[PDB]
Amino acid sequence: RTALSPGVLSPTRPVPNWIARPEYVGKPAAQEGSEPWVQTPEVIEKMRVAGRIAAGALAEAGKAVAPGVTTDELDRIAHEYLVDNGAYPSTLGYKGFPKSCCTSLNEVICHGIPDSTVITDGDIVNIDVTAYIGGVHGDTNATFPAGDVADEHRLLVDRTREATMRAINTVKPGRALSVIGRVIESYANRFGYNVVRDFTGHGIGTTFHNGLVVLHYDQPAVETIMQPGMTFTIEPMINLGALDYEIWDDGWTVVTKDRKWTAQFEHTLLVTDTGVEILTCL
Ligand SMILES: [Co+2]
Ligand SMILES: [Co+2]
Ligand SMILES: [K+]
């Protein structure tokens, strides 16, 4: 199977005009980066709805993953699930991004753009979709195997999922945030994988990336302590090869330099009074 190259982007999909757009839609930048890391009880409850809807759109698109299908089609299905449930797709028009989710096949680390690319037997594909509803965001992603995937790649996918869930089960108020990236990296290194460093989880609430940064590698210099009401993502990208990457001219698609495949999972999490709640479940 060759290295991917760009396919052709289908026309911008429309969303019902009654669905409220994030402020950043049709603007070159987003007004985000300085919002409180601990959300209000109101915002938390609204984020459960947004999380649930983003989890539904992810599951629907993942069901369509099969040799034969375009990435564009995965986007059509996610887009249509979000819209039928009253949500705006947060990626759509976010910093000029053209689609309603990110589709990252094989050696694409992240930020892949749904297009005419046809998925083949043995490929892996991450689908990352976010929902904006009631003024808040819910963000989730999963890598899905297509047909008959090599054992090397099923293991990568299974172990990326496992790293993410292990990190999720470390979340508790009063525990250092830096715990997350230590658990992830330590598990990935056990199988000789390398954790992408330059892309991170983020705080999320009324804004998409609110300024809080969640590292997926061991970085004990971070002093941030987890507090009840904090909402953020854990979304580690794990590479079979070297971390070195390139960005396509589209200004978005990140691909590994050696072309070895890479996988990712993502939940939106709430720090509760005693532990964690995953908001992006069905
Ligand atoms: Co995401
Ligand atoms: Co995210
Ligand atoms: K990938």
Q: In this structure, are strands 201-202 and 194-195 parallel, antiparallel, or unpaired? A: unpaired
φ/ψ of residue 26, rounded to 5: 70, 25
Radius of gyration for the chain, computed over Cα atoms and rounded to the nearest angstrom = 18
CA of 234 to the centre of ligand 2 (A): 7
Q: Which residues contact 192 (CB under 8 A, 6 or more apart)?
A: none
The answer on whether 148 is annotated among ligand-binding residues is: no
Q: Is 84 annotated as a binding residue?
A: no
Q: For residues 140 and 135, what is the distance between their CA atoms, to the nearest angstrom?
A: 17
Cα 18 from chain centroid?
26
> Measuring CA to CA, which residue among 2, 250, 235, 282 is closest to residue 127?
235
Per-residue HEC secondary structure of the chain comes to CCCCCCCCCCCCCCCCCCCCCCCCCCCCCCCCCCCCCECCHHHHHHHHHHHHHHHHHHHHHHHCCCCCCEHHHHHHHHHHHHHHCCCEECCCCHHHCCCCCEEEECCEEECCCCCCCECCCCCEEEEEEEEEECCEEEEEEEEEECCCCCHHHHHHHHHHHHHHHHHHCCCCCCCECCHHHHHHHHHHHHCCCEECCCCCEEECCCCCCCCCEECCCCCCCCCCECCCCEEEEECCEEECCCCCEEECCCCCCEEECCCCCEEECEEEEEECCCCEEECCCC
3-state secondary structure of 259: coil
Query: Would you state the torsion angle of the CA atoms of residues 67, 70, 71, 75, taken in this order, to the nearest 10 degrees?
Result: -120
> Which residues surround the ion ligand 3 when the cut-off is CB under 5 Å?
104, 108, 262
Neighbours of ion ligand 1 (CB under 5 A): 128, 139, 141, 266
79 belongs to an annotated ligand binding site: no
Tokens, residue 162: 């496992």
CA distance linking residue 3 with residue 33, whole number of Å: 35
The angstrom resolution of this structure is 2.0
Contact 237, 112 (CB under 8 A): no
Using alpha carbons, list the distances in angstroms from residue 119 to 72, 131, 135, 255: 10, 25, 35, 16
d(CA 254, CA 111): 6
* Domains of the chain and CATH, by start: 37-280 (3.90.230.10)
User: Phi/psi of residue 104, each to 5°?
Assistant: -120, 95
